[PDB]
Amino acid sequence: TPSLYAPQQSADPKFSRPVADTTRTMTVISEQVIKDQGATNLTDALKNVPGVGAFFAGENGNSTTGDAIYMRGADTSNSIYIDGIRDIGSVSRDTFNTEQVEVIKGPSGTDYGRSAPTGSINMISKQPRNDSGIDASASIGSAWFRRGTLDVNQVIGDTTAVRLNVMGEKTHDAGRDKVKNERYGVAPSVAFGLGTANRLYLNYLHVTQHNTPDGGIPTIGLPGYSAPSAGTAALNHSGKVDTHNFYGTDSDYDDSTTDTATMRFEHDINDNTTIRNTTRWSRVKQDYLMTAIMGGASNITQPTSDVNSWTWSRTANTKDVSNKILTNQTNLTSTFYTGSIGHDVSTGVEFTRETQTNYGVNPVTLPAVNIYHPDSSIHPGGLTRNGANANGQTDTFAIYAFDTLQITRDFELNGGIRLDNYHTEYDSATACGGSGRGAITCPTGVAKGSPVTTVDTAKSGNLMNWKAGALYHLTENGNVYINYAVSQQPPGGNNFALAQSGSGNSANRTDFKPQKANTSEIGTKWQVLDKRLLLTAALFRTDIENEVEQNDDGTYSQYGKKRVEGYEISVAGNITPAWQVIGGYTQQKATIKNGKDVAQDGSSSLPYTPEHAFTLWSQYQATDDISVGAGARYIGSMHKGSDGAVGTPAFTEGYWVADAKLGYRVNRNLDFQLNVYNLFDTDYVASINKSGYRYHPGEPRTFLLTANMHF
Ligand SMILES: C[C@H](CO)OC[C@@H](C)OC[C@@H](C)OC[C@@H](C)OC[C@@H](C)OC[C@H](C)OC[C@@H](C)O
Numbered sequence: 001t002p003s004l005y006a007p008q009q010s011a012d013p014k015f016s017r018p019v020a021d022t023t024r025t026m027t028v029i030s031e032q033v034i035k036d037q038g039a040t041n042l043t044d045a046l047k048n049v050p051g052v053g054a055f056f057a058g059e060n061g062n063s064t065t066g067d068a069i070y071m072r073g074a075d076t077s078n079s080i081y082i083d084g085i086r087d088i089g090s091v092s093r094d095t096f097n098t099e100q101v102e103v104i105k106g107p108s109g110t111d112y113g114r115s116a117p118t119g120s121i122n123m124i125s126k127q128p129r130n131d132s133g134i135d136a137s138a139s140i141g142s143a144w145f146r147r148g149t150l151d152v153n154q155v156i157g158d159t160t161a162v163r164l165n166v167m168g169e170k171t172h173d174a175g176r177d178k179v180k181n182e183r184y185g186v187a188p189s190v191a192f193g194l195g196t197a198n199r200l201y202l203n204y205l206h207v208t209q210h211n212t213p214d215g216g217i218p219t220i221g222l223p224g225y226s227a228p229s230a231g232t233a234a235l236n237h238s239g240k241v242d243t244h245n246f247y248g249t250d251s252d253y254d255d256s257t258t259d260t261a262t263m264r265f266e267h268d269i270n271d272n273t274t275i276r277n278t279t280r281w282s283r284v285k286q287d288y289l290m291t292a293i294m295g296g297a298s299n300i301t302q303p304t305s306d307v308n309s310w311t312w313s314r315t316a317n318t319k320d321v322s323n324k325i326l327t328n329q330t331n332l333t334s335t336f337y338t339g340s341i342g343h344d345v346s347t348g349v350e351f352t353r354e355t356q357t358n359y360g361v362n363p364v365t366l367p368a369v370n371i372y373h374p375d376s377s378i379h380p381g382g383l384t385r386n387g388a389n390a391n392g393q394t395d396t397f398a399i400y401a402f403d404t405l406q407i408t409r410d411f412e413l414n415g416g417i418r419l420d421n422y423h424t425e426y427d428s429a430t431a432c433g434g435s436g437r438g439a440i441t442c443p444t445g446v447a448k449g450s451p452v453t454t455v456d457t458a459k460s461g462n463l464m465n466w467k468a469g470a471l472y473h474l475t476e477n478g479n480v481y482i483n484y485a486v487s488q489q490p491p492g493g494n495n496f497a498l499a500q501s502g503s504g505n506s507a508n509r510t511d512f513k514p515q516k517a518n519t520s521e522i523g524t525k526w527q528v529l530d531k532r533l534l535l536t537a538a539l540f541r542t543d544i545e546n547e548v549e550q551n552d553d554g555t556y557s558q559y560g561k562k563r564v565e566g567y568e569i570s571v572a573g574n575i576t577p578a579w580q581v582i583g584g585y586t587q588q589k590a591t592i593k594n595g596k597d598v599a600q601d602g603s604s605s606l607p608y609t610p611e612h613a614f615t616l617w618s619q620y621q622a623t624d625d626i627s628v629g630a631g632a633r634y635i636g637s638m639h640k641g642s643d644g645a646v647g648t649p650a651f652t653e654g655y656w657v658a659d660a661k662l663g664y665r666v667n668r669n670l671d672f673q674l675n676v677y678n679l680f681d682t683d684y685v686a687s688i689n690k691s692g693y694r695y696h697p698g699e700p701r702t703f704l705l706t707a708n709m710h711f
């Protein structure tokens with residue numbers, strides 16, 4: 001029987017082997033792991049994968065929000081999937097309706113189509129089970145954190161089950177003033193034909209959120225900060241601001257809703273062959289107003305020369321966006337023999353429509369904020385739509401075919417090919433006659449404030465991708481393997497935006513080529529102690545090509561190159577029946593290989609990427625009633641991107657966070673759980689923005705008390 005900390009196989013029918021026999025760097029985080037840790041959203045689940053987190057805080061005119069995940073050196077937020085279907089949206093994803101999260105490092109275009117040059121994150125949705133039972137949870141923790149979840153599964157006939165998951169969460173922020181979050185979700189589903197050759201699964205998901213967003217705090221007093229001028233020199237001695245200070249306003253808010261409907265048909269043609277057809281409709285809506293602060297010399301106001309009277313200036317960051325996907329996917333898996341060669345085939349076709357609409361809003365002006373005594377109890381405004389919108393649409397037709405050839409009992413080959421036909425359409429417009437960062441002058445005879453179109457173009461293309469691997473069983477517990485994969489991101493694949501062809505430095509020029517990523521991997525996997533403990537180690541290199549760089553004249557072309565190289569170590573499962581573990585270590589050297597350096601200190605490293613990262617979680621059943629857990633994470637130092645701001649830190653220091661846990665079983669119906677996070681109340685930078693004026697502080701020590709009920 002498999003370990004609860006080491007799921008043996010991916011739920012995705014595109015992966016024809018268990019994790020231990022998959023020639024990929026694959027980590028599966030189970031619901032048991034997430035539950036034992038008290039992790040309630042994707043970001044906190046991903047802390048079980050080293051060097052994966054929200055490391056970029058944004059620029060000056062925008063901020064990152066939600067699951068802005070960085071992995072293998074780049075933003076991977078557009079390659080988060082639900083049940084293998086892309087889920088774009090700068091919102092945080094609750095884990096209440098999720099069975100496991102599958103993280104594959106090293107991109108492959110065969111898996112899910114276009115992607116970031118990093119890998120893939122896949123949340124697996126709960127489905128109705130064959131048993132009947134009720135699980136309920138109630139949590140109270142630091143800063144009046146309150147959470148309730150309910151999971152109900154009921155079998156009805158010989159062949160029908162229904163499942164319902166419900167979540168409610170309300171909290172302030174233990175480390176931040178005025179930041180509060182609130183969300184509610186419901187996920188009901190019904191399954192027909194269980195235990196039969198013909199199955200229907202119907203799913204629905206709704207999540208509503210109302211958060212107070214957080215733009216960060218000034219970087220005064222951090223390692224590397226210097227006052228930007230002689231005239232502001234008191235900022236070299238006035239110290240770090242209180243990490244609780246809120247620099248936003250009482251008008252700052254972040255709203256979203258998620259609505260997703262899925263319908264899955266399954267038909268067993270025989271005991272070896274199954275056809276599947278999945279249809280999903282999904283919409284994620286979000287609008288927010290949040291505060292970005294700036295601290296350059298010309299941003300600083302000095303009423304009194306006492307630094308307590310000084311102000312930084314505020315910039316509004318607004319978003320009013322809608323992301324929709326409609327898709328239909330057919331999958332066929334079959335196992336059969338051609339002579340002595342055994343085949344496990346997985347082939348399919350996908351139709352997809354993806355749309356993004358960014359609704360223009362009126363500019364919001366914010367007053368200066370006191371550096372050490374921010375007054376946030378003011379109501380500057382809210383969002384008013386102005387009719388100047390950006391519309392993106394991408395239509396995709398994809399056909400794929402994978403095969404894992406069993407050549408002998410000890411030697412396996414695997415390959416895959418995928419073809420994507422896409423058409424992308426993009427147009428944008430701005431309100432004319434403004435004075436800000438993207439203001440466009442009104443043309444003749446057009447009323448001031450009218451939507452003027454700045455881009456309206458389209459792009460059609462092909463994406464041909466493939467992968468190939470080889471695996472050898474050294475024993476019945478250990479193998480070795482190599483793997484090579486190609487992945488691409490065409491113009492308009494990152495965020496639907498396109499640029500007019502012929503000029504500019506945008507990777508989205510319709511005349512440019514896709515950014516191509518080629519990954520190589522050599523590793524070994526060992527299933528130890530009765531196949532209950534999985535140990536892995538791999539060497540990898542990703543070469544990224546067609547990056548936009550500038551020619552000797554003004555021209556731009558695609559001669560740039562980037563590279564991420566290193567090794568990966570993972571462990572997962574049971575060391576003894578009483579002792580569970582999960583964790584990993586990575587070393588990844590992300591660097592510019594051709595082109596301008598992008599790191600502030602002028603070296604070749606990529607920003608917002610730690611070079612060393614370590615995570616380890618362990619849980620031990622000390623007695624029949626009492627269990628104990630512990631966790632430790634190390635994130636290394638990283639570089640800020642280059643910006644013209646003067647005196648702001650060019651890098652951030654690595655940090656250690658430790659966690660602990662306690663579990664007490666009262667009876668089969670009731671058990672308690674005490675999680676405490678950042679055990680040593682360590683201070684650190686969790687992310688820095690591009691210019692370097694603001695950062696997100698690391699959360700302080702927090703507690704979380706949970707009551708688990710089962711019926
Ligand atoms: C609570 C049940 C448990 O089976 O499930 C609730 C969930 C299924 O629906 C909750 C949602 C509809 O509303 C969210 C809000 C009420 O916050 C949750 C919290 C207050 O719950 C009790 C929480 C122990 O706080 C109360 C206080 C005593 O700590």
Ligand SMILES: C[C@H](CO)OC[C@@H](C)OC[C@@H](C)OC[C@@H](C)OC[C@@H](C)OC[C@H](C)OC[C@@H](C)O
Nearest residue numbers: 162164188189190202203204261262263279281
């Ligand atoms: C016990 C619990 C009650 O709490 O559950 C009740 C149960 C009885 O109902 C759950 C189920 C019915 O919900 C899913 C439903 C919303 O189906 C979606 C389907 C219509 O997708 C269409 C598809 C994507 O859209 C395109 C298609 C039309 O081509």
Ligand SMILES: C[C@H](CO)OC[C@@H](C)OC[C@@H](C)OC[C@@H](C)OC[C@@H](C)OC[C@H](C)OC[C@@H](C)O
Nearest residue numbers: 326327328351352395396397421422423460461
């Ligand atoms: C409802 C369903 C989802 O449930 O979706 C509706 C559907 C509309 O989705 C789109 C699908 C039909 O895609 C095919 C086509 C629209 O894509 C353009 C492609 C053919 O052009 C590239 C072409 C090779 O490039 C030519 C190049 C040489 O210039």
Ligand SMILES: CCCCCCCCO[C@@H]1O[C@H](CO)[C@@H](O)[C@H](O)[C@H]1O
Nearest residue numbers: 659660676678679680681682683701
């Ligand atoms: C039984 C296991 C629980 C261990 C509790 C450790 C609590 C540590 O306590 C913390 O220690 C830090 C040491 O760096 C100090 O800097 C903090 O001020 C102190 O609060």
